[PDB]
Amino acid sequence: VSLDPARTDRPYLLGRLFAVLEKAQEDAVPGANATIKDRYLASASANPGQVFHMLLKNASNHTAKLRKDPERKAIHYEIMMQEIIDNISDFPVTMSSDEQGLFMIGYYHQRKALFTK
Amino acid sequence: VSLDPARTDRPYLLGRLFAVLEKAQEDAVPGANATIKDRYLASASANPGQVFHMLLKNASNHTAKLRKDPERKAIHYEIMMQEIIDNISDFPVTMSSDEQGLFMIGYYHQRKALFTK
Amino acid sequence: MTAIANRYEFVLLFDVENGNPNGDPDAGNMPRIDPETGHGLVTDVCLKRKIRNHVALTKEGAERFNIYIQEKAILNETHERAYTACDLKPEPKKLPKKVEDAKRVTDWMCTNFYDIRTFGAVMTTEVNCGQVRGPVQMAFARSVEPVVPQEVSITRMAVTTKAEAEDNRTMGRKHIVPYGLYVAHGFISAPLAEKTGFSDEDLTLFWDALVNMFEHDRSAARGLMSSRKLIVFKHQNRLGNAPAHKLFDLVKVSRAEGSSGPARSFADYAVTVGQAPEGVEVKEML
Amino acid sequence: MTAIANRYEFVLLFDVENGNPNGDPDAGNMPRIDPETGHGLVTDVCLKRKIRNHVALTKEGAERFNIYIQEKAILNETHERAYTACDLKPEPKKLPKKVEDAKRVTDWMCTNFYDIRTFGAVMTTEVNCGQVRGPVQMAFARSVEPVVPQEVSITRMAVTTKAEAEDNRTMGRKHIVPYGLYVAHGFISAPLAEKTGFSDEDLTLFWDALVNMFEHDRSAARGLMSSRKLIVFKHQNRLGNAPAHKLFDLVKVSRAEGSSGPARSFADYAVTVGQAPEGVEVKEML
Amino acid sequence: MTAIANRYEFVLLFDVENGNPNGDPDAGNMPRIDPETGHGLVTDVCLKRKIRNHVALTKEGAERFNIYIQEKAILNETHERAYTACDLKPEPKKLPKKVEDAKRVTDWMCTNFYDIRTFGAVMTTEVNCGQVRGPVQMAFARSVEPVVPQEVSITRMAVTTKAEAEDNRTMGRKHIVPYGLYVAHGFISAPLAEKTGFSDEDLTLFWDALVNMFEHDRSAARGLMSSRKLIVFKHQNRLGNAPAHKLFDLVKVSRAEGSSGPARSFADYAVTVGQAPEGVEVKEML
């Protein structure tokens, strides 16, 4: 496929993490008018180290809301998050323009994969 | 990039400590509708100095309970906790957002390792 | 209905005990907190809603004291009523061409609706009535110290709909704040009051609503909520004699001596009020 | 339905000896506690369940005193019973299009289900019936001083299932609070009673249930649980004559003189009731 | 009009608590942020509009203190007024050929309208009045530390026209900056003041507007905004005797000893101002 789970580039991994968090929020809370990409994309790409922690808090809450129901995907997203943050030593304080482009590329690559039936 | 036992960065150590506390709790008290992560993750990072110590006494209770039964994990868990505690000079009253992101990174790094093996 | 002649700022102190002061629609129903510092929050919208409820309850929808934002009310029908009262034919999306007609239609509802007269409203819709800024308005309430909400798991011995596994138990959950003392700031402006006709009796009713705001909104989730202090600064001049931030700092709340653990009652705090500047009168309404 | 014509505030004192007043579904069925301080908690839901059980035991399904939430009841089926009584066909998820019909359905539901009439309910399922806030509300019961739950391990002679590992003397456990005195607050609002028909006979039955709440709730999990005091503040007029927190502060519970060790009997506590404001009548049922 | 005879530079410090200092029209309504560092931004036009509002409020349309842009006016009508007051025909899309009259119309515009005289304006339209550069200029305000805008969900218990659930029959959005301390730079040019007539009374009124800019700008979405520091550098001669960047570097902002966690009040920042160069006088009493 197009997604490369072996890239291990910090912008790419952050984009993938953002995509999986958005998918988790979308699953946990259907019908919401705005998704994570609509709200925190600007802040996330501006200073990831300042907002990714709260994004992860919200993702944890969303996964908690999903694990209770007997249909348990929640665990799958949690393992994805373990793997993605495994390769990050620390969040970047700022991301360069090309790094932001790679961030968006990784986000879109991860998002399509999670849409597979 | 993976768990570094020699990171000696206070937010990272706090994240690892929270991960091990959560694992010990879910080992000692199975079937909980709400794990300690869901309940206390945000407060742990926001105000470590106010909530970690009570988590620590609860962890001591869990370690005693687990050690009472013939099975063991909880020796490995309590030695982990003590080792992490020595390096932490003191629990901050409040942490900056970047510090909280590092805390989340450390928590996930520690949590992944506990699953392995 | 002469408008007020002074500029007011006030500070309201209320606290919750084993309750959910304001749920968060996004974070499930967890009480609103600051994700970075952990302090609790209560949107000014919630306090304005409680004031509206108290006004509706105490005045029983008397003349000139109706609530514009009422339960399951249809705002466009209210706009149609206003147009009919003013004897105008509403345009599909637009105010009356003449300024006089637009002013009349806006003023009718600015007069015979209390919440529009006080907090203003945005009324541009398929039936357009304009805008009002409102003289009175409040900021977000913020807890003095971090709050640690606790999820309370509760079970139900009945079931909703028959099914394979459903007569059968089901598991729910509650969110509560063990305790938290919230501070809310507010401002009242004479010019906007002149524009909207905000009268003195309206101000007295507003104070009464603030002091007795929570006494009638008891519910299963809200727990015990009460208002503890209400300091109002009255300026001698219509435009004011001191910056608002200077006045808000006169009221200082801190831990009472001896108390060392997390707060669990209003007795754990000490509240002091300083001396106001020359042109400002300070009243401890509560 | 002649609704009550006053506003009430009551505080209830009950204690548990070598028992589990309310098990925590998360902490392995341990008694609920406030983790930051250790004070025990008993959710208002538990007290409401006990009141419902007492009402069902005493009235035994009278015409107007059925309980809407029972062990062997499917709520949606009960909702369908209301629509047929009102001669309506339930829309799959919405209320009747005509507001009068919806009011009829909700009033019918309140008329014959005592718990809906008292504590209110949420009944917006597929067979929608609306909502009811309920005049009577209660807050979490909180122990006067910290409790120390204990785990007691127990053994069984029998083995549940044939297991080759069998001797398999299974080790069960019970969670026990050596002693704890709990204080529970509550409110009754006349405005909501008027909207549901909460009458004076209902109020007397509620007082009776509070007095005899635990006397028929004996079981293995709970030890000797009993209610000790019940102070009722009846306000003179439809709305309050004093803030609720002021009334609750009158009932001061303090350690009895001559007691220094950990509390182990109600004699270790002394309860004193202060002077109620001029507009409030205080009567002591226990 | 005796124009000012000295060059000025000033630095303004203001902060917002749980507010939205300036929304982004093309990105929902989020507060403007630097797209690479996350620092908040407030456009100069916003501060200029606040100054205009303060002038209009405090002068009530007095003579020579009108405001050009005002609020939902037609500027071409103002240009027609100017032409009529000068006895000229505004028929051509160009300025009058006679340079004297072309200057007379613009001089009338500057004399009558305060914001034209202060900030300048472009009046090249169907009816043309020329251009004015504006003695007073101010750059973008920029927060001293990165801000994290927060989207707050809010509901409404009323519907505009009709809802599909006839459930969250209305869900809104509120953007707030938990805290941010912004720094705004500004310049005042003597030659341009001499061209337009910006006098000393105008400068005093401008200082007053800067100091009390936010005291009457309260709104539901603004939160609590306040002006904290205003340092004014005055040069001894018309053209000035020190580079602007040198002066602004004298005002320094740092966290001081409150480094614990995010900044949430002006007390978390320390402001110090150094000694001005030989020919510059720094007055900070404002």
TrEMBL record, chains A, B:
It comes from the Bacteria. This is CRISPR-associated protein, CT1133 family. It comes from Nitratidesulfovibrio vulgaris (strain ATCC 29579 / DSM 644 / CCUG 34227 / NCIMB 8303 / VKM B-1760 / Hildenborough). The chain holds residues 489 to 607 of 612 of the full protein.
From TrEMBL, chains C, D, E:
It comes from the Bacteria. The keyword Transferase does not apply. Pfam families: Cas_Cas7. The keyword Cell cycle does not apply. GO terms for biological process: maintenance of CRISPR repeat elements. Keywords: Plasmid. This is CRISPR-associated protein, TM1801 family. It comes from Nitratidesulfovibrio vulgaris (strain ATCC 29579 / DSM 644 / CCUG 34227 / NCIMB 8303 / VKM B-1760 / Hildenborough).
